[PDB]
Design an enzyme around this catalytic site. Structure first.
Site, mmCIF file in Angstrom:
data_model
loop_
_atom_site.group_PDB
_atom_site.id
_atom_site.type_symbol
_atom_site.label_atom_id
_atom_site.label_comp_id
_atom_site.label_asym_id
_atom_site.label_seq_id
_atom_site.Cartn_x
_atom_site.Cartn_y
_atom_site.Cartn_z
ATOM 1 N N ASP A 146 0.838 -1.190 0.000
ATOM 2 C CA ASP A 146 0.000 0.000 0.000
ATOM 3 C C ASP A 146 0.875 1.244 0.000
ATOM 4 O OD1 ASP A 146 -2.443 1.233 -0.094
ATOM 5 O OD2 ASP A 146 -3.201 0.323 1.748
ATOM 6 N N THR A 166 -3.490 5.052 -3.855
ATOM 7 C CA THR A 166 -2.532 5.795 -3.051
ATOM 8 C C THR A 166 -1.116 5.690 -3.593
ATOM 9 O OG1 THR A 166 -2.033 3.991 -1.515
ATOM 10 C CG2 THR A 166 -4.005 5.294 -1.101
ATOM 11 N N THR A 167 -0.857 4.745 -4.492
ATOM 12 C CA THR A 167 0.430 4.656 -5.167
ATOM 13 C C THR A 167 0.412 5.395 -6.495
ATOM 14 O OG1 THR A 167 0.771 2.483 -4.156
ATOM 15 C CG2 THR A 167 2.197 3.081 -5.990
ATOM 16 N N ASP A 175 -8.869 -2.042 1.089
ATOM 17 C CA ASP A 175 -8.816 -1.449 -0.247
ATOM 18 C C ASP A 175 -9.984 -1.915 -1.109
ATOM 19 O OD1 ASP A 175 -6.440 -0.501 0.797
ATOM 20 O OD2 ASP A 175 -5.265 -0.943 -0.997
HETATM 21 N N1 ADP Z 1 -4.878 -7.572 -13.778
HETATM 22 C C1 ADP Z 1 -4.416 -6.339 -14.087
HETATM 23 N N2 ADP Z 1 -3.919 -6.073 -15.311
HETATM 24 C C2 ADP Z 1 -3.456 -4.856 -15.637
HETATM 25 N N3 ADP Z 1 -3.447 -3.815 -14.791
HETATM 26 C C3 ADP Z 1 -3.918 -3.940 -13.531
HETATM 27 C C4 ADP Z 1 -4.441 -5.239 -13.098
HETATM 28 N N4 ADP Z 1 -4.837 -5.087 -11.824
HETATM 29 C C5 ADP Z 1 -4.587 -3.804 -11.470
HETATM 30 N N5 ADP Z 1 -4.042 -3.121 -12.488
HETATM 31 C C6 ADP Z 1 -3.632 -1.700 -12.472
HETATM 32 O O1 ADP Z 1 -2.728 -1.457 -11.392
HETATM 33 C C7 ADP Z 1 -2.897 -0.114 -10.932
HETATM 34 C C8 ADP Z 1 -3.125 -0.118 -9.429
HETATM 35 O O2 ADP Z 1 -2.303 -1.074 -8.769
HETATM 36 P P1 ADP Z 1 -1.886 -0.842 -7.235
HETATM 37 O O3 ADP Z 1 -0.516 -1.434 -7.047
HETATM 38 O O4 ADP Z 1 -2.987 -1.294 -6.315
HETATM 39 O O5 ADP Z 1 -1.705 0.751 -7.167
HETATM 40 P P2 ADP Z 1 -2.742 1.762 -6.475
HETATM 41 O O6 ADP Z 1 -2.356 1.721 -5.023
HETATM 42 O O7 ADP Z 1 -2.450 3.058 -7.178
HETATM 43 O O8 ADP Z 1 -4.111 1.205 -6.759
HETATM 44 C C9 ADP Z 1 -4.051 0.469 -11.724
HETATM 45 O O9 ADP Z 1 -3.556 1.215 -12.835
HETATM 46 C C10 ADP Z 1 -4.787 -0.756 -12.204
HETATM 47 O O10 ADP Z 1 -5.493 -0.463 -13.408
HETATM 48 MG MG MG Z 2 -5.106 -0.733 -5.962
#
Ligand code: ADP
Ligand code: MG
Ligand code: ADP
Ligand code: MG
Ligand code: MG
Lengths: 518, 41, 77, 122
Positions: A53, A86-87, A387
């Site tokens: 996170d 949040t990332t 989340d």
């Molecule tokens: N299966 C997937 N394939 C491609 N992109 C993904 C997948 N799952 C999540 N994402 C992308 O990953 C990003 C968020 O990942 P995450 O590490 O949780 O960051 P944040 O904390 O910003 O949500 C978003 O751009 C989301 O669209």
């Molecule tokens: Mg996420």
């Protein structure tokens, strides 16, 4: 020849802030996406934390530079407004500032950069809303897919099949889907208990308590009538200074006997209502449950759970329909809660839990018991479930859905490049910088997936220009594809709030020109 | 040696839980790609 | 040369300026500014994920192009 | 440098190798106490207090472990002892070996997500 700009410290401060922000962004770039990994953080006290996170990572690493602190606050604000992203928000902020670097070098004023960034933000909100599609809360498959997407990034992603339906049920159980405009995740209680595995997490519709049962032999109750007791079952004690002055031997026997009789009358008034489960609030300044009272309750076959906290009271009432009683006179049958079962369940020698399951008045409350083999994995499971609940909350707030896999970022980058070409001036450079800066999230998704970031992002831009606006990075196939076929969807609110908060934080940091040591 | 005829028996739960817990631990440790160790105060 | 540098890349930049002075006697500041600019641009290319050797090879290609273009636009005195 | 955090930072194969080294340390402590031919250990508690044991959970409880990736395996042995009562050594040995082979794959640049999916399936 204009004004000489006799001072260089404002520019030095701008560059220092930009460098710190870009450093934070580049530090957490690896924790982005389904192929992103976790960070371990050992506090100065030695408290270990494994997490994916962004808000948690930034809050836990005791950042010192002011701009980095501001990015921490930014991630916390994103966690508040959306609970997801949040990332992405921190990465977007860092990238916008890293682009402001070369803009400043070109010799554009921070105010012009700020205004052009506001323009790009408004145009990008327009673009994302155009990309978005509406959602009905009845679309359980859409809700499941949103939750699964939110969980793909976390250690609990092999358990998504289990924890996405729970994350959808919990929220759909604690809100009126027809009238709800938001959700209070305090209606969802999470109980972390060591032991078992994450496949043992459970959604309890009733009530769960860590407080221990005081009776021995009475652990299970069927057709349970439950009462909350905010008064103390012990010898009488006025709120004023009270003493019992003995001057004859008979008064001693009388004192013991009358105390017994007081306690017995209390427990009899409790039994007469049909109560077989007794939740006693926690009481300092007075014994809430004397041994005499426990003796009498046990003889009357009443389960007793004391040390209930004054902050769990509203939750317990909301859950099992009980009404808190503070005077024995008002302790009647209509002030009880009927539950089909109340049991102290054992968890494979890893502790005990009081489960009140079944309810005639199960009012908009649910509990999630998080199991796990380690303290770290339990904590990260809790965070990931939060989340997912927050993603469902975003969907409740704004009934709009956006594709994932960097599709919104690439579409944003493209259409704002076009906007920049149309807004010729010095704002054109700044808007083009905004676009190429947001084009960094797809680059990160690609790098973490293990692809060639340049080729992947170029193919993405090309397909979005052709028209495939729901096209993204398929980490399952290893390249580009329609991301809705992989079912990677996220609420429009997440992307919109990320953009808004990142742009505001960037403008704030751009309005800074000095640092003092107060 | 035929351990079922030799009498070398283990409760199934031993091996099952061993596998599950070992896998959970390995996954948790493998998920780590960074480490920030803060200087105590 | 008068600068009390400790960083080895800054020492390399001092050597760069000294080399320009040895061979030419002019340009000792242009070489340093230009090299710094090339590295500043390589920074963004590495952020986008290009191999630093690929960056260096593209720089060699562009440098050859620029050298021939200088021979092309040159004048004589 | 650029990151102003007041602490140390390990990243990548460095921290992965460290985690595997810690887990291996914990497992090599207890490997010699496995099976009918395993042998017991003395443990002295800095005061001359002696403890003889073959129980891996007991050993890892008495040890004073500093690395968090090794604390994880100690807690694993504790959890095995709580939920089963036997297997406290085998579980640690197996967890460490899974870590070793999985880090070998991650060095070969198989993505840790893929290693984790495969481990869960297996
Ligand atoms: N299966 C997937 N394939 C491609 N992109 C993904 C997948 N799952 C999540 N994402 C992308 O990953 C990003 C968020 O990942 P995450 O590490 O949780 O960051 P944040 O904390 O910003 O949500 C978003 O751009 C989301 O669209
Ligand atoms: Mg996420
Ligand atoms: N008589 C035996 N012959 C061969 N192997 C045995 C025998 N008894 C036990 N084992 C093996 O010893 C291993 C570990 O035993 P031990 O170290 O005592 O307990 P644990 O490792 O489960 O804490 C198990 O794999 C078990 O199958
Ligand atoms: Mg000159
Ligand atoms: Mg044994």
């Amino acid at each position: 020849k204009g004004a000489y700009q006799d001072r260089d410290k404002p520019a030095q401060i701008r560059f220092s802030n930009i460098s710190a922000a870009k450093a934070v962004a580049d530090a957490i770039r690896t924790s982005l996406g389904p192929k992103g990994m976790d960070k371990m953080i050992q506090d100065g006290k030695g408290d270990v934390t494994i997490t994916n996170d962004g808000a948690t990572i930034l809050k836990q690493m005791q950042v010192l530079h002011p701009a980095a602190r501001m990015l921490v606050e930014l991630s916390k604000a994103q966690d508040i407004e959306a609970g997801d992203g949040t990332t992405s928000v921190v990465i977007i902020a860092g990238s916008l500032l890293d682009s402001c670097t070369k803009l400043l070098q070109k010799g554009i004023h921070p105010t012009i950069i700020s205004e052009s960034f506001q323009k790009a933000l408004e145009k990008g909100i327009e673009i994302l809303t155009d990309m978005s599609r509406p959602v009905e809360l009845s679309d359980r498959e859409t809700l499941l897919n949103s939750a699964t997407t939110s969980l793909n990034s976390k250690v609990v992603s092999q358990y998504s099949s289990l924890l996405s339906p729970m994350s959808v049920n919990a929220v759909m159980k604690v809100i009126d889907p027809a009238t709800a405009t938001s959700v209070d995740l305090r209606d969802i209680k999470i109980v972390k208990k060591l032991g078992g595995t994450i496949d043992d997490c459970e959604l309890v519709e009733g009530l769960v308590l860590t407080q221990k049962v005081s009776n021995s032999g009475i652990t299970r109750v069927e057709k349970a009538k439950i009462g909350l007791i905010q008064f103390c079952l012990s010898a009488p004690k006025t709120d004023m200074d009270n003493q019992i002055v003995v001057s004859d031997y008979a008064q001693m026997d009388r004192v013991l006997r009358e105390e017994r009789a007081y306690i017995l009358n209390l427990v009899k008034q409790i039994k007469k209502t049909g109560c077989n489960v007794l939740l006693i609030q926690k009481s300092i300044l007075r014994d809430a449950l004397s041994d005499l009272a426990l003796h009498f309750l046990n003889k009357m076959k009443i389960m007793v759970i004391k040390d209930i906290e004054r902050e769990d009271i509203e939750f317990i009432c909301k859950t099992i329909g009980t009404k808190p009683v503070a005077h024995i006179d008002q302790f009647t049958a209509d002030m009880l809660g009927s539950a089909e079962l109340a049991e102290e369940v054992n968890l494979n020698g890893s502790g005990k839990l009081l489960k009140i399951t079944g309810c005639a008045s199960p009012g908009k409350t649910v509990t999630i018991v998080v199991r796990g083999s380690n303290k770290l994995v339990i904590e990260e499971a809790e965070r990931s479930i939060h989340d997912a609940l927050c993603v469902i909350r975003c969907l409740v707030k704004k009934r709009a859905l956006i594709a994932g896999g960097g599709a919104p970022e690439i579409e944003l980058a493209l259409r704002l490049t076009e906007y920049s070409r149309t807004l010729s001036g010095m704002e054109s450079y700044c808007v083009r910088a905004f676009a190429d800066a947001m084009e960094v999230i797809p680059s990160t998704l690609a790098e973490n997936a293990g692809l060639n970031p340049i080729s992947t992002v170029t193919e993405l831009r090309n397909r979005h220009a052709q028209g495939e606006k729901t096209a993204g990075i398929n980490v399952r196939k290893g390249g580009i594809s329609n991301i809705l076929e992989e079912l990677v969807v996220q609420p429009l609110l997440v992307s919109v709030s990320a953009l808004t908060l990142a742009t505001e934080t960037v403008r704030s940091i751009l309005k800074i020109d000095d640092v003092v040591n107060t | 040696r035929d351990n079922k005829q030799a009498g070398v028996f283990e409760p199934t739960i031993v091996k099952v839980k061993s596998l599950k817990f070992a896998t959970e631990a390995a996954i948790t440790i493998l998920r780590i790609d960074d480490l920030i160790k803060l200087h105590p105060e | 040369s008068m600068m009390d540098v400790d960083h080895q890349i800054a020492k390399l930049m001092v050597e760069l300026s000294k080399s320009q002075d040895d061979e030419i006697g002019d340009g000792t500041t242009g070489v340093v500014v230009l090299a710094g600019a090339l590295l500043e641009e390589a920074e963004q290319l590495l952020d986008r994920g290009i191999h630093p050797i690929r960056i260096a090879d593209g720089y060699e290609q562009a440098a050859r192009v620029a050298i021939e273009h200088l021979d092309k636009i040159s004048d004589s005195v | 440098g650029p990151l102003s955090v007041f602490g140390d930072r390990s990243t990548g194969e460095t921290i992965r190798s460290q985690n595997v080294m810690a887990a291996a340390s914990i497992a090599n402590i207890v490997k010699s106490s496995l099976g009918p031919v395993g042998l017991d250990k003395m443990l002295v508690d800095d005061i001359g207090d002696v403890t003889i044991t073959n129980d891996g959970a007991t050993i890892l409880k008495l040890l004073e472990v500093e690395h968090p990736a090794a604390k994880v395996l100690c807690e694993l042995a504790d959890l095995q002892d709580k939920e089963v009562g036997d297997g406290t050594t085998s579980v640690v040995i197996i967890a460490a070996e899974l870590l070793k082979n999985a880090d070998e794959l991650v060095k070969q640049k198989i993505h840790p997500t893929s290693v984790i999916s495969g481990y869960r399936l297996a």
